[PDB]
Amino acid sequence: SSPPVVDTVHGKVLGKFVSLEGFAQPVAIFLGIPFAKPPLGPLRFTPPQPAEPWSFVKNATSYPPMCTQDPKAGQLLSELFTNRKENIPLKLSEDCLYLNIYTPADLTKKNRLPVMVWIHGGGLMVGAASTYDGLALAAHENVVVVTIQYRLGIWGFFSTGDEHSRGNWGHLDQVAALRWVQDNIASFGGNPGSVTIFGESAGGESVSVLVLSPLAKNLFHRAISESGVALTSVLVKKGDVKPLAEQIAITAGCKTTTSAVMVHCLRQKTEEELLETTLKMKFLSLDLQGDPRESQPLLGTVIDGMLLLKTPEELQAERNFHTVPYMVGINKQEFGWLIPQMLMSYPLSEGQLDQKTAMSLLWKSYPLVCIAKELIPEATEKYLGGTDDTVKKKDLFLDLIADVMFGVPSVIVARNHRDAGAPTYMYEFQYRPSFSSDMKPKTVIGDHGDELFSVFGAPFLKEGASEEEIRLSKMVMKFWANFARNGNPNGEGLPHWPEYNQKEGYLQIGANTQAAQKLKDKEVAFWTNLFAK
Ligand SMILES: *[C@@](O)(c1ccc(Cl)c(Cl)c1)C(F)(F)F
Ligand SMILES: [Mg+2]
């Protein structure tokens, strides 16, 4: 039947129908809609500008390029995280400010469905919207799914610390995409007055940053951070960002005479030269050469004065953030496998860890955990000191890193959000998907990213899910879309999910799903005391 054609502010777009067996209404899919002007040439390291209007009908049936990034790490992460049966290879380009739309609405009728805007993870250095197929979630839960892209790495986050390159270009792109959704999603059957932003890892940190940003006012109405938050420190630069900028400029062949000189020089480099620079910097890899206090594993969020006016901690203390319903979740083993072993090349192949090697490694982990050298012994002893079994010590070390990067920051964010009067919900996800890499030990459960397969309905798109895994995905999708509808995940036939209030109820999600109380309470107390120094 006739492919769907939709009028947007800037012109008409042509999509395609895709049926999911068992659902009468095919899903209308629109791939590669631009939400900004391509940030090329002089527009590099500047805020996104509106897309230019087009005559006639734009064909939105091909996946867009992904933003320039390490193609090997980008393809690997896509393969590890995709919910599709086969991973789709993607082109690289600086021309990447696109979004993809999956709408289950019958576009010949009138519809105002809740909108779910996905912000992908990747450390702010890698990733793509097209990795995530919105078909199953859209059809199963009657929501419009929008997957967005945003500038990454040098292109998205290069900052001189001053007005010549403030930084946070990729977060400004996320804001631009949400403004586009406000202005256009009703033409796709979506309700611009019910937009939920959700994301995982750096995407969850981005959601948290948008909750803290005045630029995102009135652009969304619920938020979900999965395994990432603004207090995940490795993603937020405090203090002097000039050394990293100078290192990047020097690696690219640029002089560092002034900030304006550095930025102008970098704007003259080709995409290929800046990718060469990216690869020479060896981001996302644990840096084992030199003082770990000088390690820079990624270019990330800064306090730029436009998107973020103060540090997340200061904004939280001032209660200066958007008090929307907010779901904050973590996985049982955030540092269990994928980040250390696939993304960061951790020296941990051997599977036993003695306490001296653990202390040395935790010092090398400074860019991730920020533990002063004098505090390494106490932190290591707290986690590892209770056993002499060095296999158990390795597992407990992985727990330590997971608590510092994800668990404690997540609970602190949730507590501060709750204390501003906003409806707050928390979860801890514990499941080992059958879609896990064959390289992943069978004992790793609730690894970073494991909930994605449930959220995005992989059991309905990939082969070989058990019946338990199918049930888990339907329940998770319903909770998520109930939250998008109502700011409360609860509903008929679902386990009760208590609000994260003074009792600190949270939902343990897995093969058995049930409410629990006080997530990470002792750990928060320990690490808050330790970091108070
Ligand atoms: C996520 O975006 C992420 C990667 C690396 C690091 Cl250090 C952090 Cl804090 C988050 C993802 F890549 F998805 F794992
Ligand atoms: Mg070094």
Residue numbers in the entry: 4 to 536
Show passages lifted from the paper.
The covalent interactions were evaluated by nano LC-MS/MS, which offered powerful evidence to support the formation of the covalent adducts and well-explained the time-dependent inhibition of these covalent fragments. Chloro-species compounds F-3 and F-4 were chosen to detect their covalent binding sites on hCES1A. Since the activity of electrophilic warheads and the formation of covalent adducts are related to temperature, we set the incubation conditions at two different temperature points (4 °C and 25°C, respectively). This analysis certainly found several allosteric binding sites, although no expected result of any compound covalently binding to Ser221 at the catalytic cavity of hCES1A. Successfully, the co-crystallography of hCES1A with F-3 and F-4 provided promising covalent binding modes at the catalytic triad. Notably, the co-crystallisation of the parent compound F and hCES1A failed to result in similar covalent interactions. This further proves that the halogen effect may promote the formation of covalent adducts by changing the sensitivity of the electrophilic warhead. The introduction of halogen atoms, particularly chlorine, into the phenyl scaffold enhances the benzocarbonyl reactivity in forming hemiacetal adducts with serine. Co-crystallography analysis not only verified that halogenated molecules preferred to form covalent adducts, but also provided the conformational information for the design of covalent inhibitors targeting to hCES1A protein for the treatment of drug-induced acute enteritis.
Human carboxylesterase 1A (hCES1A) was employed as a target enzyme for inhibitory activity (IC50) screening due to its conservative catalytic serine residue. By the analysis of X-ray crystal structure, human CES1A has a serine esterase catalytic triad (Ser-221, His-468, and Glu-354), such catalytic triad is conserved in all mammalian species.. Herein, the halogen effects on the reactivity of the halogenated 2,2,2-trifluoroacetophenones as serine-targeting covalent warheads were investigated. Our results showed that introducing halogen atoms, especially Cl or Br, into the phenyl scaffold would influence the electron density around the ring, which led to different time-dependent inhibition response to the target serine hydrolase (hCES1A).
